[PDB]
Design a protein around this ligand. Structure first.
Ligand SMILES: *[C@@H]1O[C@H](CO)[C@@H](O[C@@H]2O[C@H](CO)[C@@H](O)[C@H](O)[C@H]2NC(C)=O)[C@H](O)[C@H]1NC(C)=O
Ligand SMILES: *[C@@H]1O[C@H](CO)[C@@H](O)[C@H](O)[C@H]1NC(C)=O
Ligand SMILES: *[C@@H]1O[C@H](CO)[C@@H](O)[C@H](O)[C@H]1NC(C)=O
Ligand SMILES: *[C@@H]1O[C@H](CO)[C@@H](O)[C@H](O)[C@H]1NC(C)=O
Ligand SMILES: *[C@@H]1O[C@H](CO)[C@@H](O)[C@H](O)[C@H]1NC(C)=O
Lengths: 448, 144, 48
């Protein structure tokens, strides 16, 4: 019956077909309209338009043009400076500002009308911290890419007071991808542990130079940050023995999800990535994952709330819209399941603090789950405890090794404390040491 | 409403976010924007219609590094207030690559003045060479 | 295939035998730290 006009702002695609976030946004408008299970008597529509991601005034024109057209939610640009322009638009009128990109949040930025489905580095950097107790490191060498890198990892940089570490934070060179002078210093620093913190496009670009710098041995134990680690062509590195542990949010362990991803890659046969990049061809980026997961969260909101409609409000005359004060409370209370699994926002500030993760790592066959993380529970990691296989303690080489023992001093005197105990420590002495001293060398569980 | 009124020298807010709006206003129309507090560059913005007279933290964070060299410290315990302040010190955080400094970065608590648990932890940690990084209204309250 | 199986460190040393080692695409391996000391009889250090 109603159209519930969406739209927003996306990347300008100067001569290419369309940017990968914008394909997901139209694919999200499509998919709900076919499957009528979501949305009774409505359809959806979109007014997409491009900016240069650095011109906030271009964003602030192109936002209020859609507001003067009248929207139901601006889905926002994908850049820090262009966010806060359109952020302050949606604070002013009451329309929601569903985001798909981590921006710097100003500490005193008293806003209400926004969410951002990209998982917060308040939580995410605790997870990277959660590994370095698990991998039992001491000597992390965090590598950020630009000045907004060192603000993301602030819960990691505030480690060494506790969980004791030794941080040696160094920086990728600006204005190029020539990490050869950077990596050469890391080799002579013997820095065998490093938390590369960049996009997946950089994460191919450093490894492909870290492969030529001889940095890809069985010693080095990389950890990435980017949530498209499962998009690297990891194939050349795979036999070498490098432990590039990481994360993903995109749950490929669902049939319904992975059906869409291959339904996706048939649609985005358009715009193939060039081959020498070090990147794959058919892959959901986690931005286009969150963009497609976003419009569901708004679609389940308008399922939960009928009678919501479109007025046309104008930035020239600052006026609160009508419905957002109701409707923003609908969005912030949502529990949709999607490509990123358990979307659940925060009834405080409109972020995403509760979310599930897979920890994927490079074993010799490829990328492979080695457990699951969430804000509770720490690292639930299916280690599949070694020392089992079809055995216990070789079961016949170590039957009980029953030893014929006489008590004689100082050889076997007697081991007493009080309150009769048992085991091999019923006796003590020179030979009782020579029981365990012959046992410490070879290895046999013995019995008196 | 100053631009349509007709001006020549917009002198801008004193904040991060509201600067970058009015800067991109000043890029399009052509009028010079002139800043007074340090804001966070995004390093990939093609805007060149702006100046900023706040002393840049490119060189301040380097000047602090020389002054910690002078005192020949080892155990600096860098303390900031807002997450912008860590960016304002980058030449100091990258220093343990170069030198034998050993930082322990620790944060003034949010939504408050109460720097007791900082100084509670700071005394027992036996650190004595602490750098603060906070506004001077804030800064006097720590020494109280 | 030594490169894809991580044996191109600063630890290894591959003396080749062939007399065409100079004419080999040594550009990706160069920075790493293998020392592929080989041979040549071709005398490219002479102008004529
Ligand atoms: C570093 O990597 C090696 C191999 O790349 C790890 O060894 C494991 O070895 C077993 C064989 O017994 C393989 O089946 C496993 O797949 C390997 N695990 C992984 C994660 O690759 C070794 O444990 C790793 N060590 C560190 C400190 O990272
Ligand atoms: C439409 O989505 C619902 C989930 O709400 C699902 O149960 C149903 O199977 C979907 N329809 C089709 C045709 O896939
Ligand atoms: C709209 O959907 C409702 C179910 O909520 C159904 O009862 C009705 O027949 C549909 N069509 C119209 C025209 O209302
Ligand atoms: C909401 O966000 C705050 C700040 O990050 C966090 O501490 C809190 O736990 C969140 N609320 C929930 C429900 O976790
Ligand atoms: C997670 O839960 C417990 C430990 O937290 C463990 O027994 C279980 O196997 C783990 N994995 C799954 C998939 O539940």
């Amino acid at each position: 019956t109603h159209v519930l006009r969406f739209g927003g702002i996306f990347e300008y695609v100067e001569s290419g077909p369309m940017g990968a976030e914008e394909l997901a946004f139209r694919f999200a408008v499509n998919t709900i309209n076919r499957n009528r299970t979501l949305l009774p008597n409505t359809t959806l529509t979109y007014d997409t338009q491009k900016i240069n991601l650095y011109d906030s005034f271009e964003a602030s024109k192109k936002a209020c043009d859609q507001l003067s057209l009248g929207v139901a939610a601006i889905f926002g640009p994908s850049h820090s400076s262009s966010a806060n322009a359109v952020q302050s638009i949606c604070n002013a009128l009451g329309v929601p500002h569903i985001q798909t990109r981590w921006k710097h949040q100003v500490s005193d930025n008293k806003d209400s009308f926004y969410v951002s489905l990209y998982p917060d580095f308040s939580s995410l950097s605790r997870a990277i911290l959660d590994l370095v107790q698990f991998f039992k490191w001491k000597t992390v060498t965090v590598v950020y890419d630009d000045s907004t890198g060192l603000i993301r990892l602030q819960e990691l940089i505030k480690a060494p007071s506790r969980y004791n570490l030794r941080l040696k934070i160094r920086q990728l060179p600006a204005d190029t991808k020539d990490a050869k002078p950077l990596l050469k210093e890391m080799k002579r620093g013997k820095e065998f542990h490093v938390i590369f913190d960049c996009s997946h496009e950089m994460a191919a670009g450093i490894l492909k130079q870290a492969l030529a710098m001889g940095m890809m041995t069985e010693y080095y134990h990389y950890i990435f940050t980017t949530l498209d680690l499962f998009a690297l062509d990891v194939e050349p590195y795979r036999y070498s023995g490098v432990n590039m542990t990481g994360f993903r949010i995109l749950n490929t362990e669902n049939t319904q999800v992975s059906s869409i991803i291959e339904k996706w890659s048939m649609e985005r046969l358009q715009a193939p990535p060039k081959p020498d990049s070090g990147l794959l061809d058919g892959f959901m980026t986690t931005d286009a994952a969150l963009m497609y997961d976003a419009v569901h969260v708004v679609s389940v909101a308008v399922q939960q709330f009928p009678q919501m409609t479109v007025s046309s409000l104008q930035c020239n005359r600052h006026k609160p819209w009508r419905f957002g004060t109701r409707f923003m409370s609908l969005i912030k209370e949502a529990h949709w399941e999607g490509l990123t699994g358990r979307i659940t926002f925060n009834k405080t500030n409109g972020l995403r603090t509760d979310f599930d993760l897979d920890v994927i790592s490079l074993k010799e066959e490829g990328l492979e789950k080695i457990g699951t993380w969430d804000p509770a529970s720490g690292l639930n990691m299916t280690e599949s405890q070694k020392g089992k296989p079809a055995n216990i303690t070789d079961s016949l080489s170590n039957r009980s090794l029953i030893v014929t023992t006489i008590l004689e001093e100082p050889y076997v005197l007697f081991k007493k404390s009080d309150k009769p105990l048992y085991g091999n420590d019923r006796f003590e002495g020179y030979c009782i040491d020579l029981l365990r001293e012959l046992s410490t060398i070879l290895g046999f569980t013995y019995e008196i």
